[PDB]
Amino acid sequence: PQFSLWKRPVVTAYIEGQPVEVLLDTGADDSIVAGIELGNNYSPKIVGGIGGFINTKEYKNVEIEVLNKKVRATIMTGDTPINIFGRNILTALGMSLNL
């Protein structure tokens, strides 16, 4: 798998078996997805980026399948406009950014 970055590197992931399109993002430390409910056992966190801050819910040991691999990783849920898989998941997948 190689993403040449001429388009957004976006793929299909399954989170707790629910399909979501996600952006593979080296500029994000963590991962954030909208439109899925992961339940009542979370820790509330605030994240900031361009345009401001949002409230998130942090969930640990969540089942994720992406790029033909299955991993358990930390996921935040929140009103993000796009679903982001940040470096915590990219490293669990063994991905690298190369020049």
Ligand X SMILES: CC(C)CN(C[C@@H](O)[C@H](Cc1ccccc1)NC(=O)O[C@H]1CCOC1)S(=O)(=O)c1ccc(N)cc1
List residues forming the annotated binding site for Zn(2+): 21, 30, 65, 79, 99
Does residue 98 bind Na ion (CB under 5 A)? no
> Which range touches Cl ion (CB under 5 A), out of 9-17, 18-26, 68-76, 77-85?
9-17
Pick from 29, 35, 43, 97 the residue near ligand X by CB under 6 A.
29
Quick one: tokens of 48? 């900031």
Cβ distance to its own copies smaller for residue 40 or 95: 95
| Cα–Cα distance, 79 to 49 (Å, whole number) | 13
Q: How far is the CB of 12 from its own copies (least distance, A)?
A: 15
Cβ within 8 Å of residue 83, ≥6 positions away? 13, 20, 21, 22, 23, 32, 33, 34
Catalytic residues: 25
